[PDB]
């Protein structure tokens, strides 16, 4: 034999590792200035003859992304003004809207005393607050947060628009993308390719419907940590988008109220025009057969003769019973009980979803720090594209030929999981020792 | 398609005798003990792993679908109801006696 140890430096071998990836991006809540400029032409090196064991649910890029997003939110909310004077007693009447029966109190014309530039003086001012923003103490109300937390008003110049952020690993680390299509979320992947940075991942805060995400490649893909478990949310990724047109048709004029020296409180003054209801339109002929594809792909997991039923949300917070999102700066909460009402047996009309607008937002499931989104002048309309769902099975006695699926809650780690499913971080260990005939 | 099957419907054993309670199932099975309709307690989580504070008399082993619950050196406390659980489904359990 007479083999001897030879040291090779820079061999292509890697192991699983966790590292603080940095952000590259091509005013916002997610700072474009703070992130480095992205590469003009990314490199995708295809690793032939490589099989890699991926895992969606133990991916640490999701946890790091969530921590970075929360910290960006906090950093954006830090320099803005504090609305501690606003937690006072408010005399609230109905905004003049004839008598709409139900939904009449959705806007409340509330008058309150506010502090001025001079500490010794007060001013009687008024503002239009939503019903969800206030709670009764016959006309005495207070903001809903006044016992639980304090509000910081979001800066008006700061925009909540998602920007595509690319997560690049540092030196000595590699990001392996699983180019394989129909790859569920876990286990082997024979089509692998290393990248410098991940694709543009828009941070979109949404519940029951993933918006502005990746559109898959071949077919609708269902991914859950275990299909048998009920507690695990099911992530569905569409192969074609479902367009959704969301609008807040109230003009909603904005006014400035000096609460202190150099501090302003932006408050809705008047709706110029008819008082209407915010909503979202989804195509019916698209959403049906999109649910058809989803049912066809769920029947692979749950059996061929099963009756796949879709029902609306069982209960919970407002962020989970309703599709919550942010459109142009205002926070919509849409019913979506018309979307998820179906029963599938093995064998230019729009769905209008009524949305309630909110201003006092407790983001990232945190309690103890609330935000007050300012009003927005003019009508706001947005066109987003549904690329997926979060779902939850009913469980229980599933021995029967029925399977009820309801929309799932907002953890926001499932939102990042649907985008970072293909990406894994590894550390390259360049040192190696092999046997060869050579000697010193 | 979860299925459960527990073999002893009724069970009587002497003190100091090793007992084996067979529960056949598919998936993550956990063993619990209920005494006289009072609140259960977790003996075994997963196939074999023992919870903290549980007596070492109880242990579990895994082979295929079957789990054994090898309890050794029965004592006056061990006489109680014993049942197996996979997720949301719980079969009615046996009842140790003397």
């Amino acid at each position: 034999e007479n083999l001897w140890v030879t040291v090779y430096y820079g061999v292509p071998v890697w192991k699983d590792a966790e590292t603080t990836l940095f952000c590259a991006s091509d005013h916002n809540v997610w700072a474009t200035h703070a992130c480095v400029p992205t590469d003009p032409n990314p490199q995708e090196i295809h690793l032939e003859n490589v099989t890699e064991e991926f895992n969606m649910w133990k991916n640490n890029m999701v946890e790091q992304m969530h921590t970075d997003i929360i910290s960006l939110w906090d950093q954006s909310l830090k320099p803005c003004v504090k609305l501690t004077p606003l937690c006072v007693t408010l005399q609230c009447t109905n905004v003049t809207n004839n008598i709409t029966d139900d939904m009449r109190g959705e806007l409340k014309n509330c008058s309150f005393n506010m502090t001025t530039e001079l500490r010794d003086k007060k001013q009687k001012v008024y503002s239009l607050f939503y019903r969800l923003d206030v709670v009764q103490i016959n006309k005495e109300y207070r903001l809903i947060n006044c016992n639980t937390s304090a509000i910081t008003q979001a800066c008006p110049k700061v925009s909540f628009e998602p920007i595509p952020i690319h997560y690049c690993a540092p030196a000595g680390f590699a990001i392996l993308k699983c180019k394989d299509k129909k790859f569920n979320g876990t286990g082997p992947c024979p089509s692998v390719s290393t990248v410098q940075c991940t694709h543009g991942i828009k941070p979109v805060v949404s519940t029951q419907l993933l918006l502005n995400g990746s559109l898959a490649e071949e077919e609708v893909m269902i991914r859950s940590e275990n299909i048998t478990n009920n507690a695990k949310n099911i992530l569905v990724q569409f192969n074609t988008p479902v367009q959704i047109n969301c609008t807040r048709p109230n003009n909603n004029t904005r006014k400035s109220i000096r609460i202190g020296p150099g501090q302003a409180f932006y408050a809705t003054g008047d709706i110029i025009g008819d008082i209407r209801q915010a909503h979202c339109n989804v195509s019916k002929a698209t959403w049906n057969e999109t649910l058809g594809k989803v049912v066809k792909q769920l029947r692979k997991h749950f059996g061929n003769n099963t009756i796949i039923r879709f029902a609306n949300s069982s209960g919970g917070d407002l962020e989970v019973t309703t599709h919550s999102f942010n459109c142009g700066g205002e926070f919509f909460y849409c019913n979506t009980s018309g979307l998820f009402n179906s029963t599938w047996i093995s064998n230019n009309d729009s769905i209008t979803l009524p949305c309630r607008i909110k201003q006092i937002i407790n983001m990232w499931q945190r309690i103890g720090q609330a935000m007050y989104a300012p009003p927005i002048q003019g009508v706001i309309r947005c066109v987003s594209n549904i690329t997926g769902l979060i779902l939850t099975r009913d469980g229980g006695s599933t021995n029967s030929t029925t399977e009820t699926f309801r929309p799932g809650g907002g953890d926001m780690r499932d939102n990042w999981r649907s985008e970072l499913y293909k990406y894994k971080v590894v550390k390259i260990e360049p040192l190696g020792v092999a046997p060869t005939r050579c000697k010193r | 398609d979860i299925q459960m099957t527990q073999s002893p419907s009724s069970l009587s054993a002497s003190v100091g005798d090793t007992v084996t309670i067979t529960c056949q199932a598919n998936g993550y099975l956990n063993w619990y003990q209920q005494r006289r309709g009072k609140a259960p307690k977790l003996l075994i989580y997963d196939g074999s792993k023992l919870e903290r504070g549980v007596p070492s008399r109880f242990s579990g082993r895994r082979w295929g679908q079957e789990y054994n619950l090898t309890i050794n050196n029965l004592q006056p406390e061990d006489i109680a109801t014993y049942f197996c659980q996979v997720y949301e489904f719980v079969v009615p359990g046996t009842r140790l006696d003397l």
Partner: nanobody
Amino acid sequence: QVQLLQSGAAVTKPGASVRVSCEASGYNIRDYFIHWWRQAPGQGLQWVGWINPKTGQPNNPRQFQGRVSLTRHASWDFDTYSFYMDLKALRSDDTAVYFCARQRSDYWDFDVWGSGTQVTV
């Protein structure tokens, strides 16, 4: 120091709602799902449903859907959490005892169960 107290046993006529309370304290209540179990006398345990503490989302079987409501309430500082189970349409079959259990992991190991609340109809 994990502790899941439960309310006293209740008696009510059919068709009148109950309010079974389960007070959880001594641990981080938010990360662990709280499930509900129902034991008829002389019968094995049955599952009523889980509730996420963070989001408040219930999940119930088709047998109990439309009747059972799982809710949760948080005090100041969130050290004590009150999980309520309310059955709307009561019936002689529902004569069971109700436990609130704490799932700790993917295993569905219910480490801590409640004392119980005998609901008699």
